[PDB]
Tab-separated table of C-alpha atoms and ligand atoms in Angstrom:
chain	number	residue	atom	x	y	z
A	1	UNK	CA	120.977	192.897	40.527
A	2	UNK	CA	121.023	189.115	39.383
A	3	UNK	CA	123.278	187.774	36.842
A	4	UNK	CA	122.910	184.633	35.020
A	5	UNK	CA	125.602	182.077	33.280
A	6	UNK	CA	124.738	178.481	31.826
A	7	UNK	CA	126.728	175.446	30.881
A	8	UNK	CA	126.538	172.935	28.627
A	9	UNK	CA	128.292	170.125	29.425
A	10	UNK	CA	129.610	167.113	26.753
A	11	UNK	CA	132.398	164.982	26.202
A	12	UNK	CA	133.711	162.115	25.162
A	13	UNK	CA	130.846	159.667	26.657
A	14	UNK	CA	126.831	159.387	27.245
A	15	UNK	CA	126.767	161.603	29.828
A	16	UNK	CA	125.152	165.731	29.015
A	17	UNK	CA	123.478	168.135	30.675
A	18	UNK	CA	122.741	171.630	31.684
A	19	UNK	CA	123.667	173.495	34.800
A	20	UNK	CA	122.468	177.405	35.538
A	21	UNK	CA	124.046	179.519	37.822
A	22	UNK	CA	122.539	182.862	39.072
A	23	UNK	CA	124.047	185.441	41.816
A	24	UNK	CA	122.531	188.556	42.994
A	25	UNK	CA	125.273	191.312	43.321
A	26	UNK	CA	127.984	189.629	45.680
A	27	UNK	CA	125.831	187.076	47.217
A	28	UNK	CA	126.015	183.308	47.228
A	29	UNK	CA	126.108	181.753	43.628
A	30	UNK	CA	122.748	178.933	42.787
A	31	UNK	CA	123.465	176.538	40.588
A	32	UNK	CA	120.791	174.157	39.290
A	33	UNK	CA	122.023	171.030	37.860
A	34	UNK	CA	120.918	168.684	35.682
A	35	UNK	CA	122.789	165.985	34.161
A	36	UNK	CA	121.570	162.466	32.392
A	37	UNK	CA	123.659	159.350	31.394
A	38	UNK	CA	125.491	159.081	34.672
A	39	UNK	CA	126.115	155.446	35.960
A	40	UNK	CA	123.788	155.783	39.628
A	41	UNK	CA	125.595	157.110	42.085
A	42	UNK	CA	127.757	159.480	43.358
A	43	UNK	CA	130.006	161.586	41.376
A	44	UNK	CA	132.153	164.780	41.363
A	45	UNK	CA	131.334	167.949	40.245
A	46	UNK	CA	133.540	170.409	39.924
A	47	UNK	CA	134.617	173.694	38.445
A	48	UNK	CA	137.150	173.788	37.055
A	49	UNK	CA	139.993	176.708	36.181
A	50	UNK	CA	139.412	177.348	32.237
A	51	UNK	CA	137.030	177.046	29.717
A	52	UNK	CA	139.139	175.689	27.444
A	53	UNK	CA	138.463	172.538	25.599
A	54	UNK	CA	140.279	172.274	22.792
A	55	UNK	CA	141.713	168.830	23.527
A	56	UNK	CA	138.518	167.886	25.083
A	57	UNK	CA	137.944	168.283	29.162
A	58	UNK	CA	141.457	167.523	30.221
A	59	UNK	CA	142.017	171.344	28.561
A	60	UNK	CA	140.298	172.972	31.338
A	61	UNK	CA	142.694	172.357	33.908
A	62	UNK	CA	142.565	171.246	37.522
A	63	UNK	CA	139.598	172.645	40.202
A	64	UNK	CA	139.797	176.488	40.260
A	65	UNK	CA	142.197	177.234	43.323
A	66	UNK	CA	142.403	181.098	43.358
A	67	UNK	CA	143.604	180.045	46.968
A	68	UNK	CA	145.758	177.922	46.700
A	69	UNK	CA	144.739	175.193	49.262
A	70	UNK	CA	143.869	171.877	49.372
A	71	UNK	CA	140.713	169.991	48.072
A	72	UNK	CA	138.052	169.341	50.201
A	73	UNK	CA	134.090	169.322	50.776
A	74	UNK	CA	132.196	172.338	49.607
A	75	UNK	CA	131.445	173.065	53.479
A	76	UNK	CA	135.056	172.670	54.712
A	77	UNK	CA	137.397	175.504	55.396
A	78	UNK	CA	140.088	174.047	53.404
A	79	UNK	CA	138.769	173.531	50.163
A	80	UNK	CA	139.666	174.664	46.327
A	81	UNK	CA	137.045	177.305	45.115
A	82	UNK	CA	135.873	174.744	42.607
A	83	UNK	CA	134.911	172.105	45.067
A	84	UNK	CA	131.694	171.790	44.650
A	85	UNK	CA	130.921	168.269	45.840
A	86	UNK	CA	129.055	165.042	44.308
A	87	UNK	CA	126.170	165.066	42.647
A	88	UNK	CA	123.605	161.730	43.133
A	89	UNK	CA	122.422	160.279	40.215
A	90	UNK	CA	119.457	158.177	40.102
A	91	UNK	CA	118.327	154.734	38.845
A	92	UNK	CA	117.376	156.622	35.455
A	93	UNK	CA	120.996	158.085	35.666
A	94	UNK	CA	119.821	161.902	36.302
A	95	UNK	CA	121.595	163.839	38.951
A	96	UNK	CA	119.010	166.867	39.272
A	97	UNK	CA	119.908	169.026	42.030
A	98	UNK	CA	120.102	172.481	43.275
A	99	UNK	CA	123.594	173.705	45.243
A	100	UNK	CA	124.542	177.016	46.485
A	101	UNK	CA	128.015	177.884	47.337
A	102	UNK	CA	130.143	180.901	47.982
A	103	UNK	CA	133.298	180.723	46.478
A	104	UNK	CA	132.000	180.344	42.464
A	105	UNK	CA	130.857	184.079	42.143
A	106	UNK	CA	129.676	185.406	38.150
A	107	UNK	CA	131.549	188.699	39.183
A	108	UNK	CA	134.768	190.288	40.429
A	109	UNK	CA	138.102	188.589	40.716
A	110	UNK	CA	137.281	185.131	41.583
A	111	UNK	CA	134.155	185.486	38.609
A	112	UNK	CA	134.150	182.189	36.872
A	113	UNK	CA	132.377	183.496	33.605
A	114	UNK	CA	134.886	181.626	31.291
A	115	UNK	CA	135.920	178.854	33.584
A	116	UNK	CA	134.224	175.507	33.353
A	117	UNK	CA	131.862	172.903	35.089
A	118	UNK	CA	132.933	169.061	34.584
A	119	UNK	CA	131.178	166.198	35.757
A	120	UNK	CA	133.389	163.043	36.658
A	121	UNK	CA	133.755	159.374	36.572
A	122	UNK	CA	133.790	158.724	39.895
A	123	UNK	CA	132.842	159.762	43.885
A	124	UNK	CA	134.871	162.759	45.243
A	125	UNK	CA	136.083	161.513	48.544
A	126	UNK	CA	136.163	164.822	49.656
A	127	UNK	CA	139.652	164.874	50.410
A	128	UNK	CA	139.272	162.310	52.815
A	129	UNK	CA	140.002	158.914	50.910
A	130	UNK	CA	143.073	158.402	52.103
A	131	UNK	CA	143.927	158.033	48.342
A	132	UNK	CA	147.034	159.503	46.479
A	133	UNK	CA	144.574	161.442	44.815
A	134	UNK	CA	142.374	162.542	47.678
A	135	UNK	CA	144.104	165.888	48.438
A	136	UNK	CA	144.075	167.114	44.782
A	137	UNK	CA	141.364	165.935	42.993
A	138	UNK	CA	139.177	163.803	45.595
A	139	UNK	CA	140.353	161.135	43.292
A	140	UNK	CA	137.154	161.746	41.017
A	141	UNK	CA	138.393	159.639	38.230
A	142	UNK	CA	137.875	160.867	34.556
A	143	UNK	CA	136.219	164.082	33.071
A	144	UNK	CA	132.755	162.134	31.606
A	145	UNK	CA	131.574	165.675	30.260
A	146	UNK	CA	132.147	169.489	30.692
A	147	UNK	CA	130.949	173.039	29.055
A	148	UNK	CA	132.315	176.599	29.322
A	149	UNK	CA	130.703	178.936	32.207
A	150	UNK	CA	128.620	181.334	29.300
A	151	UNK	CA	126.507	184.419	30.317
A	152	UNK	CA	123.211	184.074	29.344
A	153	UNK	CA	120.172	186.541	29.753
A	154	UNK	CA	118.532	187.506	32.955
B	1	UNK	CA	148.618	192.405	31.616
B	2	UNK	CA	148.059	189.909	29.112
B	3	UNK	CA	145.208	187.598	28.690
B	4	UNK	CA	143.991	185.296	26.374
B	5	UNK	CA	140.870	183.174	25.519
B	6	UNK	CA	139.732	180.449	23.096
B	7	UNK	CA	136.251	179.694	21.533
B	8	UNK	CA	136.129	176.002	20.294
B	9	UNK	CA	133.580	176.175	17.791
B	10	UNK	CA	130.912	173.074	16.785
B	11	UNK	CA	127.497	172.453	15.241
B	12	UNK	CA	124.809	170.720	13.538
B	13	UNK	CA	127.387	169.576	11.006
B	14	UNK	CA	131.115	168.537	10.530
B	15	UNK	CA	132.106	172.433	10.002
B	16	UNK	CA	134.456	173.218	13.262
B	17	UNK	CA	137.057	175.235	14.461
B	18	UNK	CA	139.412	176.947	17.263
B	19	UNK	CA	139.508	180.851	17.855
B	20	UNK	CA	142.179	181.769	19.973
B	21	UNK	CA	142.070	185.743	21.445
B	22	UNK	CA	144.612	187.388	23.215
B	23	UNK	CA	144.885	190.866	24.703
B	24	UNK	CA	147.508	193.493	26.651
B	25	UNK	CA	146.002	195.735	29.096
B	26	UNK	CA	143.205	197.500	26.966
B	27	UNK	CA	144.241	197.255	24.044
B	28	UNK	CA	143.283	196.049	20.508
B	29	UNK	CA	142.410	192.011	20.444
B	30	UNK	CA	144.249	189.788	18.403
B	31	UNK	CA	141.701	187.158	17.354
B	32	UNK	CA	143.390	183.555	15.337
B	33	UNK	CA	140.603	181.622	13.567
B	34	UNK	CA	140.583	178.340	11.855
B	35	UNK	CA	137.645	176.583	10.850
B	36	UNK	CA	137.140	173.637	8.601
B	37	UNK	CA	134.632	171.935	6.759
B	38	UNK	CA	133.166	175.571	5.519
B	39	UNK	CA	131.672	175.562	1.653
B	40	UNK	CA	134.521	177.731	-0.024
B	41	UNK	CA	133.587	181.193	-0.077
B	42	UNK	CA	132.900	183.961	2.059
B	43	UNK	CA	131.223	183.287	5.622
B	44	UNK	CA	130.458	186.358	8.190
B	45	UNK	CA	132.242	185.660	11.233
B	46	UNK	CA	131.025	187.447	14.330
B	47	UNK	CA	130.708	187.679	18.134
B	48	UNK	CA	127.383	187.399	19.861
B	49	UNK	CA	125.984	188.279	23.031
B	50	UNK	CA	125.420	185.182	24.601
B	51	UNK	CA	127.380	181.997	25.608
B	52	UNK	CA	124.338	179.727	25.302
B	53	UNK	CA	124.365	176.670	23.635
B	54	UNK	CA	121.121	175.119	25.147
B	55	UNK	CA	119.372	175.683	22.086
B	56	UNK	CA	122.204	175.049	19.399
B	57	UNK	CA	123.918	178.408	17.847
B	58	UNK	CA	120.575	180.150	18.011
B	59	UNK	CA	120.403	180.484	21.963
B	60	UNK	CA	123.968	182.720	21.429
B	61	UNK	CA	121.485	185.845	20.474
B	62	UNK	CA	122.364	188.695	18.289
B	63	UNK	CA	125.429	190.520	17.792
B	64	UNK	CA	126.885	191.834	20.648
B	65	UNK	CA	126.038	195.549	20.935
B	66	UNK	CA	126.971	197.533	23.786
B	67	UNK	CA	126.711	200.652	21.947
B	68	UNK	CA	123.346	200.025	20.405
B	69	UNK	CA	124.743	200.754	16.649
B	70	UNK	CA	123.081	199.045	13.762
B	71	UNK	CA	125.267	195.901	11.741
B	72	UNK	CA	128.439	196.963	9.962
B	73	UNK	CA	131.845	196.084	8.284
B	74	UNK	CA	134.543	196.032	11.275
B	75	UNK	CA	136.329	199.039	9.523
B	76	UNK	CA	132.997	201.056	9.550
B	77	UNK	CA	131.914	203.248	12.286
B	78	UNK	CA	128.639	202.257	12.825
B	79	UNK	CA	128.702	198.773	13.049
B	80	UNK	CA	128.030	196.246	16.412
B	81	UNK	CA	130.962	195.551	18.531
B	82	UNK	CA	130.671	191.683	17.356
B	83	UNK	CA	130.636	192.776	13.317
B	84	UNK	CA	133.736	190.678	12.798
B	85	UNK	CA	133.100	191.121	8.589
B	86	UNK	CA	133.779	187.444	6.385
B	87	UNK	CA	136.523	185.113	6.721
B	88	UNK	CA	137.346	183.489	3.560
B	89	UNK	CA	137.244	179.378	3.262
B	90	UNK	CA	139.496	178.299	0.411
B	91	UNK	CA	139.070	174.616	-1.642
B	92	UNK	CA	139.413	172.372	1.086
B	93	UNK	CA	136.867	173.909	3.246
B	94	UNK	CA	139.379	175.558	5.519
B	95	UNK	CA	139.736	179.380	6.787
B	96	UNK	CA	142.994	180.071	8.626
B	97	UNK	CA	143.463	183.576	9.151
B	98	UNK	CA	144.329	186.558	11.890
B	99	UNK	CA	142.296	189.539	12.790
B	100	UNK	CA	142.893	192.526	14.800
B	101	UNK	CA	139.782	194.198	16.610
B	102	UNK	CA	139.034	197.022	19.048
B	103	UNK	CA	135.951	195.977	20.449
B	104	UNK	CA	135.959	192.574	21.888
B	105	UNK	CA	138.183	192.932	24.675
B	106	UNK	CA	138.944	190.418	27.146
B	107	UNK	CA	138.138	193.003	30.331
B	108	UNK	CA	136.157	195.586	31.511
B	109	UNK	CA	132.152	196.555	31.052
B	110	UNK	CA	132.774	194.828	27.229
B	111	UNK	CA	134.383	191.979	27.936
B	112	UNK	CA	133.737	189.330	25.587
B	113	UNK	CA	134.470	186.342	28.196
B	114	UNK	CA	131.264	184.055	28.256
B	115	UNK	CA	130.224	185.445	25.161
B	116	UNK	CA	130.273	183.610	21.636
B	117	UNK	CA	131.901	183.463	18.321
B	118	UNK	CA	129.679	182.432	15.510
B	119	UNK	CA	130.744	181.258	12.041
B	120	UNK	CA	127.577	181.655	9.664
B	121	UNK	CA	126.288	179.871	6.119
B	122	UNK	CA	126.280	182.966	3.720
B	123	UNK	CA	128.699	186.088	3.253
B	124	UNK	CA	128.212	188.984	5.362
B	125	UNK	CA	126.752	192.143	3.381
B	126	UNK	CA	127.973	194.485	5.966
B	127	UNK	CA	125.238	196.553	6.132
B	128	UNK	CA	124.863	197.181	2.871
B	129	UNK	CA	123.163	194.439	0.884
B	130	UNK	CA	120.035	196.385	0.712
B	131	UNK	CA	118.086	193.263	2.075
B	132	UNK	CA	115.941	193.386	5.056
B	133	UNK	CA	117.934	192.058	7.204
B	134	UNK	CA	121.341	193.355	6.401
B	135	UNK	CA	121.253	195.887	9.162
B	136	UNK	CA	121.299	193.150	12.425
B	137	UNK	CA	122.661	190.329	10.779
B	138	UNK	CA	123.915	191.277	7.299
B	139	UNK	CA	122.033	188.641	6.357
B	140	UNK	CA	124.738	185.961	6.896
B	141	UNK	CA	122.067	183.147	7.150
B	142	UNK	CA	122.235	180.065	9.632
B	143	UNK	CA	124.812	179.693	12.120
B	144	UNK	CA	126.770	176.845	11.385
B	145	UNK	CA	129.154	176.323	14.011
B	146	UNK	CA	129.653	178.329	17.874
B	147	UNK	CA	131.883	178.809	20.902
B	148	UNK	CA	131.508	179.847	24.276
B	149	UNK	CA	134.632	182.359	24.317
B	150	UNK	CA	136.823	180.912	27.802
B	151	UNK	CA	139.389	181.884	29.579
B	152	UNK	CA	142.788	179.621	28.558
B	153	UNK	CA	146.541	179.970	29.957
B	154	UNK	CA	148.327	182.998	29.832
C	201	LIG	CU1	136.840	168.140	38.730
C	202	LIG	CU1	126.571	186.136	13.650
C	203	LIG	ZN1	139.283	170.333	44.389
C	204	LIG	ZN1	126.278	192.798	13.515
């Protein structure tokens, strides 16, 4: 029983992209990314708690925290639902990666079909920075682009 | 048990808009559009089944229809559960108005979250333009402008 959702992420910069997500029944979610315009390196991807972007990305919120813990690394305990990591880009500036994670499911309570994906400025220091910012955000820096969690055909 | 959502809507073109929805428990959904940069005149207005935007508007799909029903007015009984009708753009391009509808709820098996709103090029004949396509689309032409429908602060 698989159900599929796709963003399309934008903003205020070079960066776009595309990311699909696909869960069977209650299972992990897969999420295949792929982003272009990104300065090389790493940065932050996230989801985050609404699809709203009426004033552009900074509408959507902060990281989807159903839990109402901490930020972290997608394979720590202690970790906001949204946490998804960093994503590398490349020399050409393309992240293109596949993640799976558990705590972003298309279905049930914690479904984020309506939520959003945002890409950001900077490395997410996994909570770990040391930085004002580490415990909330991972001190990501700016939202570079971002697009509503749709459904889309299986 | 209130909940609301909001469709920013965007295109090919310089025609855009915000749709905000809002609904208690399971009742009736309060939908307020504006859109600007619309030729004066009527445009259909209408929810589709999909909220992808990989491919422009067109990726969004047809109507949404749960029920299987062929294209009508909103007051009609046979009509899709997206058959919003025409909103009306006055001299300056603009279309500000409120609608009330039973069948794009914000829960349950017919949510609408993830889904799309579509503003079109040409009126909506409701079914009953005698034209060949007036009973999927009511032959309301291109899609000019479209939203992925996301959750937004209560
Ligand atoms: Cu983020
Ligand atoms: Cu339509
Ligand atoms: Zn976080
Ligand atoms: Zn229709």
């Amino acid at each position: 029983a698989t159900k599929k959702a796709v963003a399309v992420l934008k903003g205020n910069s070079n960066v776009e992209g595309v990311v699909t997500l696909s869960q069977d029944d209650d299972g992990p979610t897969t999420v295949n990314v792929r982003i272009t315009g990104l300065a090389p390196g790493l940065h932050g991807f996230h989801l985050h708690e609404y699809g709203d972007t009426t004033n552009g990305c900074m509408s959507t919120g902060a990281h989807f925290n159903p839990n109402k813990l901490t930020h972290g690394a997608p394979g720590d305990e202690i970790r906001h639902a949204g946490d998804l990591g960093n994503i590398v880009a490349n020399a050409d500036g393309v992240a293109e990666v596949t993640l799976v994670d558990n705590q972003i499911p298309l279905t049930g309570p914690n479904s984020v079909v309506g939520r959003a994906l945002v890409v950001h400025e900077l490395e997410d220091d996994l909570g770990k920075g040391g930085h004002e910012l580490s415990l909330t955000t991972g001190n990501a820096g700016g939202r570079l682009a971002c697009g509503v969690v749709g459904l889309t055909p299986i």
